[PDB]
Amino acid sequence: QYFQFYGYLSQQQNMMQDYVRTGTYQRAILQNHTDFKDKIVLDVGCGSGILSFFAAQAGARKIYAVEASTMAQHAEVLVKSNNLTDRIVVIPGKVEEVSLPEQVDIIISEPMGYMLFNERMLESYLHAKKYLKPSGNMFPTIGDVHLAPFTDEQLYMEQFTKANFWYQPSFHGVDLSALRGAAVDEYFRQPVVDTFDIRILMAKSVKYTVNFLEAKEGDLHRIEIPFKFHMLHSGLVHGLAFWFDVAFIGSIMTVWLSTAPTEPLTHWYQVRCLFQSPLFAKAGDTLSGTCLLIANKRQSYDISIVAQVDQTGSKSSNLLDLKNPFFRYT
Amino acid sequence: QYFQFYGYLSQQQNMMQDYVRTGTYQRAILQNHTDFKDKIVLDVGCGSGILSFFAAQAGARKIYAVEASTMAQHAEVLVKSNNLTDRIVVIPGKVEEVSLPEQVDIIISEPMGYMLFNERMLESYLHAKKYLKPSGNMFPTIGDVHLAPFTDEQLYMEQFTKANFWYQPSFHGVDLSALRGAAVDEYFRQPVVDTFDIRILMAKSVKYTVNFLEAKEGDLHRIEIPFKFHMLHSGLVHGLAFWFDVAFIGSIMTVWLSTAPTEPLTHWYQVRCLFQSPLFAKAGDTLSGTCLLIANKRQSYDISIVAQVDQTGSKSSNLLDLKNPFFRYTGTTPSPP
Numbered sequence: 001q002y003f004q005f006y007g008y009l010s011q012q013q014n015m016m017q018d019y020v021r022t023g024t025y026q027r028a029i030l031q032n033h034t035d036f037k038d039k040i041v042l043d044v045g046c047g048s049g050i051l052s053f054f055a056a057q058a059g060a061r062k063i064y065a066v067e068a069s070t071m072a073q074h075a076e077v078l079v080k081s082n083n084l085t086d087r088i089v090v091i092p093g094k095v096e097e098v099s100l101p102e103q104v105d106i107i108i109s110e111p112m113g114y115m116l117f118n119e120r121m122l123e124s125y126l127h128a129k130k131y132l133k134p135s136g137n138m139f140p141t142i143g144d145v146h147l148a149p150f151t152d153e154q155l156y157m158e159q160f161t162k163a164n165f166w167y168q169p170s171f172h173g174v175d176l177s178a179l180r181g182a183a184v185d186e187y188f189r190q191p192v193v194d195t196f197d198i199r200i201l202m203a204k205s206v207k208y209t210v211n212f213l214e215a216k217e218g219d220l221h222r223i224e225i226p227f228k229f230h231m232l233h234s235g236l237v238h239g240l241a242f243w244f245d246v247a248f249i250g251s252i253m254t255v256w257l258s259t260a261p262t263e264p265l266t267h268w269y270q271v272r273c274l275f276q277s278p279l280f281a282k283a284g285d286t287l288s289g290t291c292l293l294i295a296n297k298r299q300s301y302d303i304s305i306v307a308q309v310d311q312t313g314s315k316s317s318n319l320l321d322l323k324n325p326f327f328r329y330t
Numbered sequence: 331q332y333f334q335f336y337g338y339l340s341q342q343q344n345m346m347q348d349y350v351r352t353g354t355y356q357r358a359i360l361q362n363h364t365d366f367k368d369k370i371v372l373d374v375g376c377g378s379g380i381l382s383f384f385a386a387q388a389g390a391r392k393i394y395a396v397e398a399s400t401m402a403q404h405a406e407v408l409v410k411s412n413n414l415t416d417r418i419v420v421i422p423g424k425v426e427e428v429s430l431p432e433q434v435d436i437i438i439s440e441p442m443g444y445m446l447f448n449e450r451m452l453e454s455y456l457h458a459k460k461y462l463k464p465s466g467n468m469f470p471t472i473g474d475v476h477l478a479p480f481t482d483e484q485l486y487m488e489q490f491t492k493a494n495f496w497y498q499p500s501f502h503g504v505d506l507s508a509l510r511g512a513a514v515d516e517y518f519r520q521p522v523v524d525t526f527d528i529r530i531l532m533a534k535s536v537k538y539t540v541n542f543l544e545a546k547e548g549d550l551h552r553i554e555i556p557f558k559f560h561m562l563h564s565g566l567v568h569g570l571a572f573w574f575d576v577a578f579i580g581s582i583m584t585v586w587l588s589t590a591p592t593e594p595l596t597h598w599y600q601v602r603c604l605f606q607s608p609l610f611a612k613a614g615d616t617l618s619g620t621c622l623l624i625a626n627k628r629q630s631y632d633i634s635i636v637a638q639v640d641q642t643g644s645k646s647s648n649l650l651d652l653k654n655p656f657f658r659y660t661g662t663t664p665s666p667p
C-alpha cells in the first residue's frame with residue numbers, strides 16, 4: 001500500500017511542483033556546491049530522482065539513488081534521458097536492504113512528514129548513516145519541532161458536535177449513547193491538519209531539536225518533548241499547535257525550510273492536538289508538560305500530551321492518533 | 331488497513347448519517363415487515379449494527395450480525411445497551427470464516443461500492459448465501475449497473491494539462507520529457523469520481539443486471555458488459571459514464587436505492603472512464619463494444635473498455651484501474667454542453 005502509492009507519477013508530480021520544497025532543496029544543494037563537488041552522495045527515497053539531479057548539477061562524482069517503489073524504473077528513464085548514466089546510479093530497494101559499493105560523503109533526502117516525524121521515514125534516513133564516511137554530512141542536517149498553545153473555541157465545538165452524534169438516545173429508534181465516551185475519545189485523538197492565524201497562539205513556541213548527524217534510528221521510537229510556556233494572553237487553551245523547520249547546514253551557508261505559520265503555507269500545513277477539556281490560563285502563568293511520541297506498527301506514532309497550568313494545578317492528559325488525522329483545510 | 335479503517339466510529343457515523351443509505355434501508359425493511367417478522371436474519375458487515383436493529387424493529391426472531399473489524403466490539407455494546415441480546419447475536423469475524431448455528435430466511439447488507447462492484451464486498455454478500463434457506467431472500471435483491479457515452483471536452487483536456495507537467499526540458503534544470511507518455515497513461519487509467527449534467531450523455535443508457543438471488547460469488551471475478559449505444563446527439567465521445575441502482579424486492583413492495591445522475595447526489599457520485607482516443611459519432615450512429623471488469627488483488631477491478639463507431643470503424647481501446655480513482659468533485663454546478 002505504502003510503496004504502491006509512491007509508484008504513481010501523480011504523487012511525485014505533486015511533491016515536485018511544490019516550489020518552496022523543490023526550490024529550497026535546490027538552493028541548499030547548489031549554494032553549498034563544495035559539499036557535493038567530486039563527492040559521493042546517497043539519495044534516500046529518491047522518487048523521480050530530482051534531488052540526485054541537484055547533486056549532479058553541483059558536481060557530485062557519483063550519486064547512489066535508492067528508491068523502494070516502482071518509481072525507481074521512472075528515475076532510471078530520467079537518468080538516461082538526461083545523459084547522467086555515469087554519475088547517477090539508481091539502486092532499486094529499501095535503504096535498509098540494498099547493497100552500496102562504497103561509503104558516501106553526504107546523504108540527502110526529503111523524509112519529513114506531518115509534525116516532522118509522521119510516516120517514520122526519518123528512521124530510514126538515520127539507518128542510512130551506516131554508509132556515511134566519518135567526515136560526512138546530511139541534508140537536512142537538523143530538524144526543529146515547534147509547539148505552542150492555541151485558543152480556538154470554534155474548532156473545539158466542531159469536533160465536539162461530531163462526537164455528540166453518539167449521544168443520541170434514539171437514532172432511527174436506536175440508542176447510541178453507550179458509545180458517547182468512546183466517540184468523544186476517538187474524535188479528540190484526531191490531530192487536526194490545517195493552518196490558522198498566528199494570533200490564536202497564546203505563548204512563544206518551544207523548540208525541540210533533532211540533530212540527524214547525532215541521532216540513532218532507535219531514538220525515534222520514543223521521543224519525549226518537554227515544554228514550559230510563558231502565557232502571553234489570558235483565556236482557554238484548546239490544545240497545542242505543532243510545526244517544524246529543517247536546516248541544511250552546509251560548508252558555505254545554512255539554508256532553512258520552514259513550515260511555520262508565519263511563513264507561506266506549505267503542504268505540511270500545521271498540526272493541532274486538541275484537549276478534550278480546554279484549560280484556562282492567565283497571562284503570566286506557566287503551562288508545563290511533556291509530548292511523548294511512541295512509535296507504532298502503522299508507520300506512525302501514539303502521542304501522549306500532558307499539560308498543566310502550574311499556578312492552579314489545572315491538568316489536561318491527552319492522546320493523539322497520528323494514523324487518523326482530520327484534514328480540515330478548505 | 332481495510333478493517334482498521336472500519337474500526338473508527340467516525341467512519342461508521344459517516345455512513346449512518348447518510349440518509350439515502352440509512353433511511354432507504356429502514357423503509358425497505360419496515361415496509362416489508364412480513365419478510366422479517368419471526369424470521370432468522372444474517373447481517374453481513376453490520377458495522378455499528380444499524381441494519382440489525384432495523385430487522386429487530388420489524389420483528390425478527392434472531393439476527394446474526396457479522397462484522398470483521400473491531401467495530402464488532404462497539405456493536406456488542408449497542409446490542410446490550412438496547413436490551414436486544416436475546417435477538418441480535420454479534421459474531422466477530424469474516425462472513426467467510428465464521429459459523430452460524432442455523433440457516434437464515436433473509437440476508438441483509440450494504441455491500442455497494444463505486445460502479446456497484448468496487449471494494450469487492452458483493453463477493454462476501456454472495457458467499458453468505460451458503461447460510462440462506464432454499465427459498466430465502468436477499469436485501470438488496472438485484473443491482474443494475476447503467477452505462478452511457480458522454481462528451482466532456484474540458485475533463486478530457488485536463489488529463490493533458492496535468493500530464494504536460496512532465497513535458498518540460500528544464501524543470502529546475504532537469505529534462506522531465508521522457509516520462510510524459512507514462513504520465514498521460516497513468517491519468518487516463520484513473521476512473522473519475524464526480525457528478526455531471528445529464529445533457530452531456532449522448533445516448534440512452536444500457537443496463538447490466540446482477541440478480542443476487544441467482545448470482546454466484548465467482549460471477550463477480552469477471553464481469554462482461556456488452557453495449558450497443560444508439561447515438562441521440564452528434565459529437566466527440568470522450569468515454570463512458572457509470573452509475574447503479576439496487577432494489578429491495580420484498581413480499582409487500584419493492585424499494586429502490588438509485589445513484590443515477592437524474593436523482594439527488596449520493597456519496598457514490600457517478601464514475602466516468604475516459605477514452606484516451608475519443609470517437610466522433612453522429613446522431614443515429616451506433617457505438618458498440620465491451621466493458622470487461624476483471625477482479626484484482628486490491629479489492630478492486632482492472633477495467634477494459636473497447637468501443638467502436640460501427641458506421642466509420644473508428645475504435646478506442648482503454649484500460650483503467652479502479653484502485654486509483656480520481657476524486658474530482660468540488661461542488662460547483664455541472665455544465666451542459
Ligand SMILES: COc1ccc(CCNC(=O)[C@H](N)CC[C@H](CNCc2ccccc2)C[C@H]2O[C@@H](n3cnc4c(N)ncnc43)[C@H](O)[C@@H]2O)cc1
Nearest residue numbers: 006011014015022045047067068069094095110111112124
Ligand atoms: C496529493 O499528492 C500527494 C503526494 C505525495 C504525498 C506524500 C508526501 N510525503 C512526503 O512528502 C515525504 N517527505 C516523503 C517524500 C519522499 C520523496 N522525496 C522526493 C523529493 C525531494 C525533494 C523535492 C521533491 C521530491 C518519498 C519517497 O521515499 C521513498 N522511500 C521511503 N522510504 C524508503 C526506504 N526505506 N527506502 C527507499 N525508498 C524509500 C518512497 O517510495 C517515495 O518514493 C501525499 C500527497
Ligand SMILES: COc1ccc(CCNC(=O)[C@H](N)CC[C@H](CNCc2ccccc2)C[C@H]2O[C@@H](n3cnc4c(N)ncnc43)[C@H](O)[C@@H]2O)cc1
Nearest residue numbers: 336344345351352375377397398399424425440441442454
Ligand atoms: C468519508 O467516510 C467514509 C466512510 C466509509 C467509507 C467506505 C464506504 N464503503 C461502503 O459504503 C460499502 N458499502 C461497505 C459498507 C459496510 C457497512 N454498511 C453499514 C451500513 C448499512 C446500512 C446503512 C448504514 C451503514 C462495511 C462494513 O462491512 C464490513 N465487512 C466487509 N467485508 C466483510 C466480511 N467479509 N465479513 C465481515 N464484515 C465485513 C467492514 O468491516 C465494515 O464495517 C468511505 C469513506
